[PDB]
Design a protein around this ligand. Structure first.
Ligand SMILES: Nc1nc2c(c(=O)[nH]1)N[C@@H](/C(S)=C(/S)[C@H](O)COP(=O)(O)OP(=O)(O)OC[C@H]1O[C@@H](n3cnc4c(=O)[nH]c(N)nc43)[C@H](O)[C@@H]1O)C=N2
Ligand code: SF4
Ligand code: SF4
Ligand code: F3S
Ligand SMILES: [Mo+6]
Lengths: 509, 1242, 225
């Protein structure tokens, strides 16, 4: 029993409008450098589809995540320590630049410098950002399948269509599309960390953000295969890997991440979650993969339980963090309302970025239809997005928790309409799904009204604990190059001292 | 030493039974990302693009440069029961930062090399620049040498000194020798950047140049609105969607085109609201709804009619709804009496009965011919309050109080005459559901459906007699409702295939009849249960069809029948362009120099380009084929452009150029003729010694010569009939594929001169201001580097929310860029000196069409009279346009531009038919902007910076100054006789300042300029004031107009709505197969909904947007159509027709229904486009295949709600009816001499 | 000749060794961000699997051989592995490695110079270091036929005499080389040169061979620091 905290994220897919604003803001701030211009820490994919990189969900091809051996022990699908080491000269599974797309630019200056007397109007053609050579044609991009862009037989290769008879969905009337925005999961049992030979990847203790140390990374590029979500991108120029850093510079002072604060749809929720680090392996090694979801929920702790509060304190959790945890929207959607589900729990990484499945128009029927248990509003059975599809995505193929979330969402709707249109109290739908009036009203507060202060409840990472904030306040930022940053030993070959430190020791004790 | 650090100690406790290890090692490296996030400061700014977004952003400056942006989240929060707006934003918005130092930034003023060479050589022989310009423009080979260089490279770096002089010189020459109205400017949607638009508009107004329109030109103007409410466009705010319990997104892709507001839609669902999407394809909007209906594109009006049918049947006839009944009784023209005309064996609906028609004139001395009549429940006839006749000439009766216009007593209008008729008459109704192309299903009945209407005979004041009936009765018949008279053309069941039944529409639309019935029922039931909280969000999906009015009136009737308009949570939510510049009357005087001279030269752009880019010379549509079957065909002969010319001379629509003679010389000639200028012009117009320029657009003096383009990409976006603009306006190579009227030997117009070889290259000088080298720039003569939205001050408002916020300079404009405001200020300055000796204190004769909201709107009450045809005298301001006298002080242009004129104090300020005193505001402005020390404008407030201008707008507008807001409501109270000041009394002290909005966006003040309220308990909902304050809709009847009784409306078969199939542009059958490349060609409907990776063409060159999209111009096709054509996903394809051709790559998809193709709006002509195999030129753009085709009903003027107004009414640029030929390309030649060409096999 | 002899085998070896060590230390302390393997695999997977494995498996074979061959003293099992036995091994075991190595390296160089994406993103040092290694490998294999003329391990004894004198800092190391075949001199010079260029090339990845990983706990967590 060792309690740790992390700011989790829940995305309400039902509200996602597939706008990509989240992707653009992340790109502008973090990955506009040459080397990672093709990398999209945050990317949005339209489903059905194979995504970015192409078919990242196919673990038989890419070898991401873990596997539970027959002896019950966990091993990365990539192979054990030696197997992995024996693949280091050339990672046999490494996705190629082409699996993403070849980053391109256009020759705009040709519109400006086109010489006088040109036979045809000048134009700007594409050029490779990798070779600088002229590109005959752009044949791929990071969001190439946006809004069902491509033949159905192509998009349906989607790994999430397994065990589903998909023929019916190629018919115009049964068409359906949804959006899947994604970033790094910042897992409790990250495969990347387990697959990095040099140990450059780590999970921060105070907030669970997983980073790739840019000093220590050696560019062994195995972590990339290791991540089953393929959210680690190789910086082809620096030779090191980079990934979503959960905007730690902001989180550290209590701010939302950029993709969270900039989400036009107001679908992202940030809240603390307390977990028992000592239960991680036990939970991720459970025999049946349809249990990882529930096993993870069991790894999460109740913030209002004095037993947990006292243990958190004893274990070093700041008081403000415990408080933030007690009013965490992420906990309300994952633990109480059971609306949020993990992304591909079967990878056994214990993902910390969850999703609320989306609703969708009713399916095509013989006639205008009839009033179901929810009147004019939809019943869960009438939704056109095949629930089995959603289950392959969020619950390892188990449709029970998906239906439960969808049903409850519709229940809330049914109750609110009774209240606002009929001006009556009708809890028929709520009781059917096991929700109380109070729970429904609260669900409505967070999901519908979604005040800024309710979507983001981020505590400080308290950069002052166990460190020396005073000399840091006074000297950080003066980057003259003192050469003493990054090590604990004071001795340095250039005979220098830290600019943001006190080297004249007090002699008064 | 990191090396020494490698030397057990850093190992803490393990966890999870040895599965994990806690390390106590250095983390200093984390500073690496921290220092990237850190910045110098954040500045508040927004985007000056036409998106209706109006989102406030945080501009981050780091290392003294703009590096990125994130949304501001500090908007004043909405009520506790409503979700807030933060963070708003969209993808394009998030990528603007890219422009600032991108490879496509315009840094210096540029000039076509060929033009510069002749300029510098001409200046060496002519010390005076005006005469230097003359030496080049009056030479045929010189003029031609640079006009044919347009779009063909050769831009060289110039300087502000050089271009400012050439521009000024050219303007002077053009004004002096041809007329001020031969100089024009095009800039759209001022709400997105009020002062930036004002810059050019102000300079142009002062010098008399024409200011072209945009709302109608872009087809955002829904003519149906002016028709029904007498309002350009007023809609509820997005927040109000959250007060609705039933919403239908009809032809509106909310999540993609209203991104920053979508959440109100996804969230209101959790409140119990049901949502329904109506789109032919599986659009993004569908993903968010509970039901998806997919009618065949263009057939939507059919569905609406059917739904209206069910509603009337079920909630008006069978089980009448109290709420709906009272609602249509008091707020529509339904109880209004219509006179019946005698046909052959049957009657036809004529104009509406007027007080004047009755003997004692119902006691109406004032404007009796402009007041509608109805029957009260006691059988008595009466002229009810609110008719447009009570608006002018009298006071206190222009309201919706159900009272008798004579006695002033409380009456009750009766709806149907059924039950008190003197006999049953048979009235014929036009039916077009049987016509149409092969691409849309049709249903045969009769061109004229006869219905049995209950009537009453009246004894008219002129002795004769006539039959009458109510709009109501007429409406139920048009809808096919059986009322007991046993009408063979009325429905017997919803399955009966008759005039607008669910079964009928099922055939036209393809939407299951039961679906139509179910949703019609739910919608109406909801509206009944909530008192109008049903709403329809509609957009370009319907409004860009030639028959947009029918599509719209269909939706409008549904809402009116269910009493949804004017109620929070209900109504007509039209969202297209960002046309709601809230501080209207504070901005108008600034943008059109109305503080100095009145009036300015406004022009409706569709007619302007139709005429000058000569798109009429290729017209395939005839007015005759749009005529009602019950109209006298011989009374409407002529080319569609002939109706425009007549409309102009009758004072209905504006003109540009106005006259065939320099309007600055007319005064000197009246002086010699011994008569004043006005009278002398009317005498010449009657004599024909002076003619309207429209009559001879190619004689060499009636075509614009100088054009300014800014905040617009006219020649790569909005420009319908692109190839025609390149040929007739620019004089460069073009890709037009068809022959003109002359070549086909068709009938020439009867109002416009004809000449086989059309005049080309009419534009002498095209000047474009922009921050990126757009398609328009590429085809200009002079490019002026302007400041990005992150480098200047300005303001922005939108229809979506009530906040007014600013654009601010994060840093000074980079390189040699300047804000639009400073560019025009400098030009006006050089103009003021260059003009000395050529222009002084001139006298200008300006024509001004009859204005809506002015007393003159009451022009021709009963019919149409063409003075040129001798049907009446030429009376300016009534049967022709006003002929105004305007004095211009050309040398003082700059001083006037940089100061607020004396007219605000002398005459006052106002708008929308009301005026108030604005002296106190001017005194405040003298203290805030300081005053001119000397010169012509001595003592007047200053306008040096964009900020002074912004402050001018804020201080003068009632929306941003409570003081003015009260004087404004006071003014309107004189008309209605009801107090409206209470709407703003509790905010009278309120005064919005520019610097305050930089600190935090501010909510505006309820103003008479609009019909919604800015309140803390009720959201902003259009028409709320009419319904709750009893203020009339500026329509003939004062109520919402279901019946249009204008001669033209009646004869073009649109007195009542009716189904109209998409028109045939006949642009395919003449070129299909004429240039085979070996691949199969097929005809498909060409739709251009607005894109996801940009806003129009802006952002289309933005690498971020291009990388998230498909890397350049693309076109969507159904899988079936692509497979038939042998087209694979991403193959190079060519789309073309009579108007031109374009090249692009295909996106094959299942969500695209067979029969249609979509090239998401504006991807323009500068990125990734190969040569055409059809024109042998650079591939064209989406508007290379479209062509303007005006509609007569949109030219109607001098008739109450149907009277002109800048962006209020006028012809529109529809384009969804268009068809194209599609095919896989073969040879992919880039025409760049790179030798990097390809060939697509099979 | 005698001058160039003492320089290259008495002096130079110590210059290259000082630059190798202090250069590695200095670049480790002040160039952590530059301390990477610089993989280019993603940009062009074609042929990398075969070529890289061929090169690395071979080059490592040689290294084990060179290491134990010249740095292991004689009195250490001189009865069970006398000088000529070591030579037999180095010629067949090492020669086979060297063949695998040369093929891999040649394929890698062909790719680095002619694969558009790799060539466009390469640095000069990457071409220079890889070219010198291919050459050093060919040279190495070319010494096989020369060592075959002295199957008694007389040649190998001289080279091992030199190497061992150099690393124990015993002056006169070049004497041990008296009369050895020229091809061996070139191999030694170009080889030590690789050590000199080591700290300023991608070779620094060698220092980071991840042995620790074999015994490391899977999950890592860093405390507040
Ligand atoms: N991202 C982005 N946002 C913008 C703009 C932009 O360029 N980009 N521009 C502004 C401006 S200026 C306008 S005029 C509007 O956005 C137009 O959007 P709207 O959704 O009304 O039109 P659109 O023409 O796209 O049509 C919407 C959808 O309706 C479907 N549709 C098309 N034709 C029909 C039809 O005949 N009937 C029906 N029922 N539906 C039809 C279609 O799915 C389309 O996407 C607005 N904001
Ligand atoms: S910003 Fe929000 S709504 Fe838009 S795509 Fe990203 S997650 Fe979805
Ligand atoms: S472009 Fe318009 S909608 Fe997009 S962020 Fe800017 S203002 Fe908002
Ligand atoms: S495997 Fe480790 S060495 Fe770097 S490239 Fe991945 S974090
Ligand atoms: Mo528009």
């Amino acid at each position: 029993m060792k309690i740790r905290s992390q700011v989790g994220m829940v995305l309400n897919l039902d509200k996602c409008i597939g706008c990509h604003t989240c992707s653009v803001t992340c790109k502008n701030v973090w990955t506009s450098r040459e080397g990672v211009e093709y990398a999209w820490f945050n990317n949005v994919e339209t489903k059905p589809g194979q995504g970015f990189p192409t078919d990242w969900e196919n673990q038989e091809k890419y070898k991401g995540g873990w596997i539970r051996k027959i002896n019950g022990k966990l091993q990365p699908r990539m192979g054990n320590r030696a197997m992995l080491l024996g693949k280091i000269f050339a990672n046999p599974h490494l996705p190629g630049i082409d699996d993403y797309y070849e980053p391109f630019d256009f020759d705009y200056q040709n519109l400006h410098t086109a010489p006088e007397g040109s036979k045809s109007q000048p134009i700007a053609r594409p050029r490779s950002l990798i070779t600088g050579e002229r590109m005959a044609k752009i044949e791929k991009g990071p969001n190439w399948e946006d809004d069902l862009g491509g033949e159905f037989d192509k998009l349906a290769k989607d790994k999430n269509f397994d065990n589903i008879q998909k023929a019916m969905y190629s018919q115009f009337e049964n068409t359906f599309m949804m959006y899947l925005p994604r970033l790094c999961e910042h897992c409790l049992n990250p495969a990347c960390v387990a697959t990095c030979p040099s140990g450059a990847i780590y999970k921060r203790e105070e907030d669970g953000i997983v980073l790739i140390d840019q000093d220590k990374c050696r560019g062994w590029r195995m972590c990339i295969t290791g991540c089953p979500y393929k959210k680690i991108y190789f910086n082809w120029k620096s030779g090191k890997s980079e990934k979503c850093i959960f905007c730690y510079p902001r989180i550290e002072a209590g701010q939302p991440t950029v993709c969270s604060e900039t989400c036009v749809g107001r679908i992202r929720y940030l809240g603390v979650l307390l977990y028992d680090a000592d239960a991680i392996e036990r939970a991720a090694s459970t025999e049946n993969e349809k249990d990882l979801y529930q096993r993870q929920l069991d790894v999460f702790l109740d913030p209002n339980d004095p037993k947990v509060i006292e243990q958190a304190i004893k274990d070093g959790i700041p008081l403000s963090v415990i408080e933030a945890a007690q009013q965490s929207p992420v906990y309300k959607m994952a633990m109480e309302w059971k609306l949020a589900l993990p992304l591909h729990p079967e990878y056994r990484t214990l993902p910390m970025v969850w999703y609320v499945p989306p609703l969708s128009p009713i399916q095509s029927a013989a006639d205008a239809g009839e009033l179901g248990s929810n009147g004019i509003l939809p019943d869960v059975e009438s939704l056109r997005i095949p629930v089995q599809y959603l289950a392959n995505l969020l619950t390892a193929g188990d449709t029970k928790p998906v239906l439960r979330a969808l049903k409850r969402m519709l229940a809330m709707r049914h109750y609110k309409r009774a209240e606002t249109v009929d001006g009556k109290v009708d809890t028929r739908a709520l009781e059917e799904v096991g929700l109380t009036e109070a729970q429904a009203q609260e669900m409505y507060r967070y999901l519908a009204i979604a005040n800024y202060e309710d979507r983001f409840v981020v505590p400080s990472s308290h950069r002052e604990l166990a460190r020396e904030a005073f000399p840091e306040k006074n000297g950080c930022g003066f980057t003259f190059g003192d050469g003493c940053h990054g090590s604990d030993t004071k001795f340095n070959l250039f005979n220098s001292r830290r600019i943001d430190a006190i080297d004249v020791t007090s002699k008064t004790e | 030493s990191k090396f020494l650090d490698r030397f057990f100690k850093q190992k803490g406790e393990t966890f999870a039974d040895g599965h994990g290890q806690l390390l106590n090692t250095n983390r200093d490296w984390e500073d690496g990302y921290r220092q990237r996030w850190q910045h110098d400061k954040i500045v508040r700014s927004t985007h000056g693009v036409n998106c209706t977004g109006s989102c406030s952003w945080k501009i981050y400056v780091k290392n003294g440069l703009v590096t990125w942006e994130t949304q501001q989240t500090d908007y004043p929060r909405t009520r506790p029961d409503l979700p807030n707006h933060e963070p708003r934003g969209c993808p394009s918005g998030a990528s603007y930062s890219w422009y600032l130092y991108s490879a496509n930034r315009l840094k210096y003023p540029m000039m076509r090399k060929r033009l510069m060479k002749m300029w510098r050589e001409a200046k060496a022989l002519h010390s005076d620049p005006v005469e230097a310009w003359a030496s080049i423009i009056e030479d045929a080979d010189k003029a031609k040498s640079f006009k044919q260089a347009r779009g063909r490279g050769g831009f060289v770096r110039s300087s502000w000194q050089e271009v400012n002089e050439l521009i000024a010189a050219s303007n002077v020459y053009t004004i002096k020798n041809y007329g001020p109205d031969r100089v024009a400017g095009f800039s759209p949607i001022p709400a997105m950047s009020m002062v930036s638009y004002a810059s050019g508009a102000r300079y142009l107004s002062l010098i008399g140049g024409t200011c072209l329109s945009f709302y109608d030109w872009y087809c955002d103007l829904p003519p149906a609105s002016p028709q029904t409410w007498g309002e350009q466009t007023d809609v509820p705010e997005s927040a109000d969607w959250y007060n609705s319990s039933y919403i239908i997104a009809w032809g509106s892709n909310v999540p993609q085109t209203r991104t920053p507001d979508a959440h109100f839609f996804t969230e209101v669902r959790y409140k119990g609201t049901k949502t329904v999407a109506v789109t032919p394809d599986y659009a993004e909007i569908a993903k968010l709804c509970d039901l998806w209906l997919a009618p065949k594109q263009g057939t939507d009006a059919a569905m609406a009619l059917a739904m209206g049918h069910v509603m009337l049947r079920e909630f008006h006839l069978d089980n009448p709804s109290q709420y709906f009944t009272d609602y249509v009784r008091r707020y529509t023209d339904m109880p209004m009496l219509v006179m019946l005309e005698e046909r052959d064996g049957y009657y036809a609906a004529g104009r509406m009965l007027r007080a004047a028609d009755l003997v004692d004139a119902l006691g109406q001395e004032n404007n009796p011919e402009w007041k509608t009549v109805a029957f009260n429940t006691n059988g008595e006839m009466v002229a009810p309050n609110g008719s447009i006749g009570f608006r002018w000439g009298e006071k206190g009766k222009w309201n919706l109080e159900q009272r008798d216009g004579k006695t002033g007593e409380e009456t009750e209008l009766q709806l149907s005459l059924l039950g008190s008729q003197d006999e049953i008459a048979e009235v014929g109704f036009p039916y077009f559901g049987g016509d149409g192309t092969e691409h849309f299903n049709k249903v045969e009945l009769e061109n004229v459906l006869l219905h049995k209407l209950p009537v009453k005979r009246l004894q008219l004041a002129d002795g004769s007699t006539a039959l009458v009936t109510t709009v109501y009765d007429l409406t139920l018949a048009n809808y096919g409702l059986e009322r007991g008279l046993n009408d063979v053309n009325c429905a017997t069941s919803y399955d009966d295939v008759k005039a607008y039944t669910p079964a009928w529409a099922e055939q036209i639309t393809g939407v299951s009849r039961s679906q139509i019935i179910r949703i019609a029922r739910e919608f109406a039931d909801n509206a009944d249960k909530t008192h109008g909280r049903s709403m329809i969000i509609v957009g370009a999906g319907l409004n860009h069809w030639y028959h947009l009015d029918m599509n719209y009136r269909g939706l409008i009737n549904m809402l009116i029948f269910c009493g949804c308009v004017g109620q929070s949570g209900g109504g007509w939510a039209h969202y297209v362009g960002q046309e709601k510049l809230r501080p209207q009357t504070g901005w108008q005087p600034l943008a059109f120099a109305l503080d100095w001279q009145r009036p300015a030269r406004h022009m409706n752009s569709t007619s302007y380009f139709y005429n000058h880019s000569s798109q009429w010379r290729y017209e395939t549509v005839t007015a005759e084929e749009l005529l009602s079957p019950m109209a006298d065909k011989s009374r409407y002969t002529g080319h569609l452009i002939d109706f425009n010319v007549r409309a102009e001379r009758m004072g209905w629509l504006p003109s540009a150029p106005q006259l065939g003679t320099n309007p600055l010389t007319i005064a000197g000639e009246a002086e010699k003729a011994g008569m004043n200028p006005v009278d002398y012009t009317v005498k010449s117009l009657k004599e024909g010694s002076i003619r309207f320029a429209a009559e001879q657009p190619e004689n060499g003096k009636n075509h614009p010569r100088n054009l300014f383009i800014w905040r617009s990409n006219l020649l790569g976006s909005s420009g319908k009939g692109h190839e025609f603009m390149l040929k007739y306006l620019l004089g460069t190579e073009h890709g037009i594929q068809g022959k003109d009227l002359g070549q086909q030997g068709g009938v020439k117009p009867e109002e416009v001169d004809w000449q086989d070889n059309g005049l080309e290259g009419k534009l002498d000088l095209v000047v474009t201001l922009d921050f990126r080298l757009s398609s328009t720039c590429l085809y200009s003569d002079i490019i002026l580097p302007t400041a990005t939205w992150y480098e200047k001050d300005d303001m922005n408002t939108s229809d979506m929310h009530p906040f007014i916020h600013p654009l601010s300079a994060a840093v000074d404009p980079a390189w040699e860029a300047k804000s639009d405001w400073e560019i025009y200020k400098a030009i006006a300055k050089k103009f003021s000196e260059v003009c000395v000796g050529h222009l002084g204190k001139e006298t200008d004769i300006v024509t001004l069409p009859i204005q809506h909201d002015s007393a003159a709107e009451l022009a021709q009450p009963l019919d149409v009279k063409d003075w040129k045809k001798g049907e009446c005298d030429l009376i300016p301001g009534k049967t022709a346009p006003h002929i105004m006298v305007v004095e211009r002080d050309y040398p003082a242009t700059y001083e006037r531009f940089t100061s607020i004129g004396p007219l605000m104090e002398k005459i006052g300020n106002g708008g929308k038919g009301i005026a108030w005193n604005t002296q106190s505001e001017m005194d405040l402005l003298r203290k805030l902007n300081y005053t001119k020390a000397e010169g012509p404008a001595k003592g007047q407030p200053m306008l040096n910076t964009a900020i002074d201008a912004a402050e001018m707008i804020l201080t003068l507008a009632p929306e941003t100054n409570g003081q003015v807001a009260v004087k404004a409501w006071a003014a309107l109270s004189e008309f209605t006789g009801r107090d409206h000041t209470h709407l703003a009394l509790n905010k009278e002290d309120e005064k919005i300042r520019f610097r305050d909005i930089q600190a935090q966006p501010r909510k505006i003040i309820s103003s008479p300029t609009w019909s919604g309220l800015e309140d803390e308990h009720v959201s902003y909902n259009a028409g709320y004031t009419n319904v709750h304050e009893l203020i009339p809709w500026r329509t003939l009847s004062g109520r919402q107009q279901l019946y249009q009784d204008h001669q033209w409306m009646r004869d073009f078969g649109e007195s009542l709505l009716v189904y109209r199939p998409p028109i045939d542009t006949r642009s395919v059958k003449e070129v299909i197969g004429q240039k085979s490349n070996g691949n199969q060609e097929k005809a498909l409907n060409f739709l251009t909904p607005h894109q996801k990776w940009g806003i129009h063409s802006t952002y289309s060159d933005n690498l971020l947007m291009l990388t998230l999209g498909r890397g350049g111009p693309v076109v969507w096709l159904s899988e079936a159509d692509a497979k038939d054509l042998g087209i694979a996903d991403n193959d190079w394809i060519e789309v073309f027709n009579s108007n031109g051709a374009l090249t692009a790559r295909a996106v094959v998809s299942q969500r695209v229904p067979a029969g249609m193709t979509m090239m998401y709006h504006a991807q323009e002509r500068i990125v990734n486009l190969p040569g055409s195999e059809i024109t042998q030129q650079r591939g064209g753009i989406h508007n290379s295949v479209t062509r303007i085709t005006p509609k007569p009903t949109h030219m109607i003027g001098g008739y109450a709600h149907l009277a002109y107004g800048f962006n209020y009414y006028g012809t529109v640029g529809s384009n969804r009816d268009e068809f194209v030929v599609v095919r896989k390309m073969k040879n992919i030649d880039w025409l760049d001499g790179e030798g990097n060409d390809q060939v697509q096999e099979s | 000749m005698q001058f160039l002899n003492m320089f290259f085998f008495d002096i130079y070896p110590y210059i290259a060794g000082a630059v190798f060590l202090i250069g590695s230390w200095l670049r480790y302390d002040y160039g952590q961000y530059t301390w990477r393997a610089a993989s280019s695999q993603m940009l062009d997977r074609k042929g990398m699997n075969l070529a890289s494995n061929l090169f690395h498996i071979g080059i490592l074979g040689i290294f084990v051989g060179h290491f134990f061959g010249m740095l292991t003293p004689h009195w250490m099992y001189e009865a069970w592995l006398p000088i000529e036995v070591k030579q037999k091994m180095a010629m067949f075991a090492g020669g086979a490695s060297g063949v695998l190595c040369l093929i891999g390296g040649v394929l890698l160089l062909k790719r680095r110079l002619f694969s558009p994406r790799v060539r466009a993103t390469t640095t000069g040092a990457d071409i220079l270091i890889l070219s010198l290694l291919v050459i050093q490998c060919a040279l190495g294999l070319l010494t096989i036929p020369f060592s075959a003329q002295h199957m008694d391990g007389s040649e190998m004894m001289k080279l091992v005499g030199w190497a061992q004198s150099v690393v124990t800092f015993h002056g006169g190391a070049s004497q041990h080389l008296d009369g050895v075949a020229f091809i061996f001199r070139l191999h030694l010079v170009l080889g030590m040169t690789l050590f000199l260029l080591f700290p300023f090339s991608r070779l620094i990845h060698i220092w980071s061979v991840p042995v620790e990983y074999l015994t490391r706990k899977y999950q890592l967590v860093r405390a507040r620091h």
